[PDB]
Design an enzyme around this catalytic site. Structure first.
Site, PDB file in Angstrom:
ATOM      1  N   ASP A 199      -2.848 -14.471   1.364  1.00 45.58           N
ATOM      2  CA  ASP A 199      -2.078 -13.686   0.428  1.00 45.58           C
ATOM      3  C   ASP A 199      -1.302 -14.587  -0.531  1.00 45.58           C
ATOM      4  OD1 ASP A 199      -0.450 -11.914  -0.887  1.00 45.58           O
ATOM      5  OD2 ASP A 199       0.243 -10.886   0.939  1.00 45.58           O
ATOM      6  N   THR A 200      -1.922 -14.931  -1.657  1.00 44.08           N
ATOM      7  CA  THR A 200      -1.294 -15.848  -2.611  1.00 44.08           C
ATOM      8  C   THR A 200      -0.040 -15.258  -3.276  1.00 44.08           C
ATOM      9  OG1 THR A 200      -2.809 -15.196  -4.423  1.00 44.08           O
ATOM     10  CG2 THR A 200      -3.452 -17.090  -3.048  1.00 44.08           C
ATOM     11  N   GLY A 201       0.096 -13.932  -3.273  1.00 41.32           N
ATOM     12  CA  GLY A 201       1.300 -13.277  -3.797  1.00 41.32           C
ATOM     13  C   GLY A 201       2.482 -13.224  -2.848  1.00 41.32           C
TER      14      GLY A 201
HETATM   15  C1  MZ8 Z   1       1.931  -7.118   1.541  1.00 41.99           C
HETATM   16  C2  MZ8 Z   1       0.504  -7.157   0.994  1.00 41.99           C
HETATM   17  C3  MZ8 Z   1      -0.521  -6.741   2.043  1.00 41.99           C
HETATM   18  C4  MZ8 Z   1       0.322  -6.291  -0.260  1.00 41.99           C
HETATM   19  N1  MZ8 Z   1       1.248  -6.720  -1.336  1.00 41.99           N
HETATM   20  C5  MZ8 Z   1       0.778  -7.922  -2.060  1.00 41.99           C
HETATM   21  C6  MZ8 Z   1       1.649  -9.141  -1.743  1.00 41.99           C
HETATM   22  O1  MZ8 Z   1       1.039 -10.343  -2.247  1.00 41.99           O
HETATM   23  C7  MZ8 Z   1       3.046  -8.960  -2.313  1.00 41.99           C
HETATM   24  C8  MZ8 Z   1       3.160  -9.178  -3.832  1.00 41.99           C
HETATM   25  C9  MZ8 Z   1       4.603  -9.019  -4.291  1.00 41.99           C
HETATM   26  C10 MZ8 Z   1       5.244  -7.788  -4.240  1.00 41.99           C
HETATM   27  C11 MZ8 Z   1       6.575  -7.667  -4.647  1.00 41.99           C
HETATM   28  C12 MZ8 Z   1       7.267  -8.781  -5.112  1.00 41.99           C
HETATM   29  C13 MZ8 Z   1       6.631 -10.015  -5.161  1.00 41.99           C
HETATM   30  C14 MZ8 Z   1       5.310 -10.134  -4.759  1.00 41.99           C
HETATM   31  N2  MZ8 Z   1       3.985  -9.931  -1.770  1.00 41.99           N
HETATM   32  C15 MZ8 Z   1       4.889  -9.683  -0.830  1.00 41.99           C
HETATM   33  O2  MZ8 Z   1       5.039  -8.617  -0.247  1.00 41.99           O
HETATM   34  C16 MZ8 Z   1       5.855 -10.781  -0.529  1.00 41.99           C
HETATM   35  C17 MZ8 Z   1       6.443 -11.440  -1.614  1.00 41.99           C
HETATM   36  C18 MZ8 Z   1       7.379 -12.455  -1.421  1.00 41.99           C
HETATM   37  C19 MZ8 Z   1       7.754 -12.792  -0.130  1.00 41.99           C
HETATM   38  C20 MZ8 Z   1       7.183 -12.112   0.946  1.00 41.99           C
HETATM   39  O3  MZ8 Z   1       7.541 -12.446   2.208  1.00 41.99           O
HETATM   40  C21 MZ8 Z   1       6.238 -11.110   0.757  1.00 41.99           C
HETATM   41  S1  MZ8 Z   1       1.687  -5.504  -2.326  1.00 41.99           S
HETATM   42  O4  MZ8 Z   1       2.376  -6.069  -3.451  1.00 41.99           O
HETATM   43  O5  MZ8 Z   1       2.596  -4.718  -1.556  1.00 41.99           O
HETATM   44  C22 MZ8 Z   1       0.398  -4.620  -2.809  1.00 41.99           C
HETATM   45  C23 MZ8 Z   1      -0.279  -5.031  -3.965  1.00 41.99           C
HETATM   46  C24 MZ8 Z   1      -1.418  -4.368  -4.422  1.00 41.99           C
HETATM   47  C25 MZ8 Z   1      -1.910  -3.250  -3.757  1.00 41.99           C
HETATM   48  N3  MZ8 Z   1      -2.988  -2.474  -4.045  1.00 41.99           N
HETATM   49  C26 MZ8 Z   1      -3.137  -1.460  -3.164  1.00 41.99           C
HETATM   50  S2  MZ8 Z   1      -1.961  -1.409  -1.886  1.00 41.99           S
HETATM   51  C27 MZ8 Z   1      -1.257  -2.789  -2.609  1.00 41.99           C
HETATM   52  C28 MZ8 Z   1      -0.113  -3.482  -2.146  1.00 41.99           C
END
Ligand code: MZ8
Lengths: 99, 99
Positions: free
Chosen positions: A25-27
């Site tokens: 999970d690069t995000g």
């Molecule tokens: C938790 C994951 C399984 C899913 N998340 C993607 C993560 O990479 C998220 C991205 C994000 C969201 C909000 C703010 C920043 C980044 N990342 C995190 O939840 C996350 C971010 C920073 C620190 C951490 O511990 C977690 S997500 O963003 O919740 C997501 C995105 C697209 C999507 N399409 C259908 S359901 C769905 C869910």
């Protein structure tokens, strides 16, 4: 390996002798695992995602083998919707984005 | 290009007359953009992650340029804290994970 993204990049990890599936999970800044027991002291921590903030337990210097590559670092345990490997460990195993 | 993950993989995207910074996110099935008043039809949807769910509007067949690579596809618009480029578009620009 090289991993394409037409499917979720789910990989097998090894943590405390247990095998789990986790999402590369690069995000995600952090590595966050669903409820589980890990040994040692943890610290209460809060993290934010798309839906708001949750409370997690923070375990430091935990070995995880991710798809055969060794990492030792911070693992957070709490109500994540799925096991995710974040950038803190993705960097340790030398994972990059390429296009 | 190769993007290391020491920092957040933010890149410049273009959607109409708006340039935005967005995460290349292998953990995202779908593309989620911060609130913007795009033209055309849409459908309501709820998507879930850490912290719970948010309400988004699904727009189909929206052209997006990502680092000079052309894409076209579904974009979810809602109160996300960060612009997220998900797998639906990452594949279109030839993006892989490598380690
Ligand atoms: C938790 C994951 C399984 C899913 N998340 C993607 C993560 O990479 C998220 C991205 C994000 C969201 C909000 C703010 C920043 C980044 N990342 C995190 O939840 C996350 C971010 C920073 C620190 C951490 O511990 C977690 S997500 O963003 O919740 C997501 C995105 C697209 C999507 N399409 C259908 S359901 C769905 C869910």
């Amino acid at each position: 390996p090289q991993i394409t993204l037409w499917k979720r990049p789910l990989v097998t990890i090894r943590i405390g002798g247990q095998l789990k599936e986790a999402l590369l999970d690069t995000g995600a800044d952090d590595t966050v695992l669903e409820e589980m027991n890990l040994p040692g002291k943890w610290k209460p921590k809060m993290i934010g995602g798309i839906g708001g903030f949750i409370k997690v337990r923070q375990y430091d210097q935990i070995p995880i083998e991710i798809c055969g590559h060794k990492a030792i670092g911070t693992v957070l345990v709490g109500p994540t919707p799925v096991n995710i490997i974040g950038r803190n460990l993705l960097t340790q195993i030398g994972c990059t984005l390429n296009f």
